[PDB]
Amino acid sequence: SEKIAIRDFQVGDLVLIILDERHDNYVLFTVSPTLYFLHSESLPALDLKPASRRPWVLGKVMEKEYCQAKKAQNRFKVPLGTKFYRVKAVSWN
Amino acid sequence: AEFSRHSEKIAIRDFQVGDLVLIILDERHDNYVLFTVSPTLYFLHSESLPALDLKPRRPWVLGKVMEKEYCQAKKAQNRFKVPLGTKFYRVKAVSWNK
């Protein structure tokens, strides 16, 4: 049976996707100090939307992209220089 | 394989001793449960609450399964708020960090 990854996310991992209101974004539930932000493109297929939002959904990792915040005002509400991932995911059930 | 990917995943069904798990508050059953995708309920044993820093409010903790016991409700009024005849598990668990 499949388990949910909570760190070191790989393509094909099952993940718990949760709302992070501080960063105005969905993230992967993790014990890591690194932020894994859900790519905006993946929201529709997970029955998620860009005013109250569902707290969590299960998904499967399809893609991840390494990023560094090079502008202070960014869509992720992270400080300048933050190193993070953007993750595309699809639904699982 | 010469090595395993170690301690990077939590179980969400068919829980086995030693599994890492997400423990969550089940308000409708007035009890902590293992987060699961299966219809079977896995209730946290009352013995396990103090060492997890829970009280008989905190929404969730990561844990490790120390024991599971398959049970059936014999009375309609019971601490788990389940109908008479419900089959469920009681799980002992300790905190897990890393």
Residue appearing with tokens 């990854």 = A5
Cα(B58)–Cα(B32) distance, rounded to whole angstroms? 10
Residues 37-56 on A with a CB inside 8 Å of B are none
Report how far residue A42's alpha carbon sits from residue A26's, in angstroms, rounded to the nearest whole number: 10
Q: Are A55 and A47 in contact (CB under 8 A)?
A: no
Q: Does A71 touch chain B (CB under 8 A)?
A: no
What are the tokens at B82?
Answer: 């389940």
Residue A40 resides in a domain: yes
* B28 CA: distance to closest CA in chain A (Å): 18
Q: Which residues contact B55 (CB under 8 A, 6 or more apart)?
A: B49
Instruction: Please answer whether residues B8 and B59 qualify as being in contact, where contact means their C-beta atoms are separated by less than 8 angstroms.
Output: no
Residue A87 lies in a domain: yes
Radius of gyration of chain B (CA): 14
Count the Cβ atoms, other than its own, within 10 Å of residue B10. Answer: 24
Rounded-to-integer distance, Cα B13 and Cα B53, Å: 24
Q: Whole-angstrom Cα distance, residue B12 to residue B20?
A: 9
Residue B70 in domain: yes
Resolution at which this structure was determined, Å = 1.8
Measured distance CA(B89)–CA(A78) in Å, rounded = 42
Residues of B in contact with A4 (CB under 8 A): 9-10, 12, 22
Specify the number of domains making up chain B. 1
